[PDB]
Scaffold this active site. Sequence first.
Site, PDB file in Angstrom:
ATOM      1  N   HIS A   1       0.839  -1.241   0.000  1.00  0.00           N
ATOM      2  CA  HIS A   1       0.000   0.000   0.000  1.00  0.00           C
ATOM      3  C   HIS A   1       0.863   1.275   0.000  1.00  0.00           C
ATOM      4  CE1 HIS A   1      -4.394   0.524   0.608  1.00  0.00           C
ATOM      5  NE2 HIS A   1      -4.391  -0.785   0.350  1.00  0.00           N
TER       6      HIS A   1
ATOM      7  N   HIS B   1      -2.262  -1.582   8.562  1.00  0.00           N
ATOM      8  CA  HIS B   1      -3.401  -1.858   7.640  1.00  0.00           C
ATOM      9  C   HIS B   1      -4.079  -0.586   7.149  1.00  0.00           C
ATOM     10  CE1 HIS B   1      -7.135  -3.438   6.037  1.00  0.00           C
ATOM     11  NE2 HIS B   1      -6.514  -4.612   5.910  1.00  0.00           N
TER      12      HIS B   1
END
Length: 129
Positions: free
Chosen positions: A16, A124
């Site tokens: 990410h 996350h």
Amino acid sequence: MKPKGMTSSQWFKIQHMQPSPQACNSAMKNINKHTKRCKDLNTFLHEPFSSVAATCQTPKIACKNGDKNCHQSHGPVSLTMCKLTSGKYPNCRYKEKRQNKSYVVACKPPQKKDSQQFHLVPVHLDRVL
């Protein structure tokens, strides 16, 4: 046992990180190798884990139902939503979509790779806002 060379936020920065992953096509390629499959969709953010790390310091929210481990950017961050354009799992090519919105990333204590020590590294991604 526990990861190594890829702290929680580290594994999620290769999955990410938009600071410069080399095109979601390649950024996602590192995920198809660690997942043996092309998730079909992968989002990335464009802010240094040191800045995203601090961004993950604003008030959190009951992630699951009271986890309070998510953190939404106090504003719009130049993020990048990549999507699986097509190809399959071993030949999937993605397109990088540069968007700007305040997202929500969760945080955790620097496993062992700890780029520095943060104490809530950006692991996350709860969602994009």
